[PDB]
């Protein structure tokens, strides 16, 4: 049991992910060239990821000494930020997939629907729709002292008479409304998009527009796939533990989910020419 591994991972996230997501948000806000709908959704994704990387030193205080020394208000804020990130990331990815599906399979409605102002409104609606879990976690979050080991734990406090039923209900609802249904929507959208691409891959004929559209679609696909494989082990582990070396597997799943907040700027830099150019200009003007 060497504790510096996951702590070093957390620290690398805490710095690099914050720096990269801040750069992404600044580039999107500053340049008028980068004010597109998919870029607005990417801005929302970067905002959520940068918010979740601020609480990294508070996460690493567990697994180092296995207790919560930060108090009730900080526990509430941390739980709220975690749930906000979890819901907002997947909802923003679902809306990115839907936007790409509209841009690919319904180009006639893309001009009307894919304006950046509509993307901004959708981002606010996503943040407000995920606020049903953020505010709930603020209300229910707190610290309860263990009466068998004198260890303080930061988690949601459902009523004691029905803790077992409330805990299973919340974990089940989170699994279906934050993993299963959005993943099904993404899969349907991408199956239809692949079919349309291949069918027109016989006779697609507008060089610049088709090139840009397919490049951005590939970027969104890679981002969704990385999120999928980074957030799958933790969901399955939580579900299995709720229903049915384990602690070694438990904290590897938690750490793997948090590393997704740092890989998005790398993905944008490697898979987007405009983002790479903006990053180069910012680093070396």
């Amino acid at each position, epitope marked *: 049991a060497i504790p510096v591994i996951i702590t070093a991972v957390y620290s690398v996230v805490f710095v690099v992910g914050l720096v990269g997501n801040s750069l992404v948000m600044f580039v999107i806000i500053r340049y008028t060239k980068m004010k597109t709908a998919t870029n607005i959704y990417i801005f929302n994704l970067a905002l959520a990821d940068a918010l979740v990387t601020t609480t990294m030193p508070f996460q690493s205080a567990v697994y180092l000494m296995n207790s919560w020394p930060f108090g009730d208000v900080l526990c509430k804020i941390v739980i709220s930020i975690d749930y906000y990130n979890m819901f907002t990331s997947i909802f923003t990815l679902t809306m990115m997939s839907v936007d790409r599906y509209i841009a690919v399979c319904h180009p006639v409605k893309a001009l009307d629907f894919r304006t950046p102002l509509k993307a901004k409104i959708i981002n606010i609606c996503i943040w407000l729709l995920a606020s049903s879990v953020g505010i709930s976690a603020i209300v229910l979050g707190g610290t309860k002292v263990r009466e068998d080991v004198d260890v303080i734990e930061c988690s949601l406090q459902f009523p004691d008479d029905e803790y077992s039923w409330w805990d299973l209900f919340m974990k089940i609802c989170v699994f279906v409304f934050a993993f299963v249904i959005p993943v099904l929507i993404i899969i349907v959208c991408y199956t239809l998009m692949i079919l349309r691409l291949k069918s027109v*891959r*016989l*006779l*697609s*004929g507008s060089r610049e527009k*088709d090139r840009n559209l*397919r*490049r951005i679609t590939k970027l969104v696909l890679v981002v969704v796939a990385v999120f999928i494989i980074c957030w799958t082990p933790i969901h399955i582990f939580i579900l299995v533990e709720a229903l049915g070396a384990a602690l070694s597997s438990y904290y590897f799943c938690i750490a793997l989910g948090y590393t997704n907040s740092s890989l998005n700027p790398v993905l944008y830099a490697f898979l987007d020419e405009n983002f790479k150019r903006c990053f180069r200009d910012f680093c070396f003007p």
Partner: nanobody
Amino acid sequence: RQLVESGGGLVQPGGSLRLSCAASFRLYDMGWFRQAPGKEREGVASITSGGSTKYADSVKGRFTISRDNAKNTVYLQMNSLEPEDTAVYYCNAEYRTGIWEELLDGWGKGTPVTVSS
């Protein structure tokens, strides 16, 4: 990608020939162009993905072209070859490097064909 042509050989007048242009992720527009020594480049056939075929005025009624979508290869059939058809046939091809890549135009190396014996 690499474009390969074949089917160029010495043919007596009135004979028949079958060309072959292949590439080795999928081909969109695949045409056939002839270039005589004393003439500018001129297209003779152009087949789309759906099977639509276009022929030149001189090429009409004698030239047959079809597209094989399985192997992404074309054969174009010479009928009633004449010395006026002595030229080099170039394979103009439209293709995409990858499903998430731009559309590009591929030009074959060119094959020499002479109707003489």
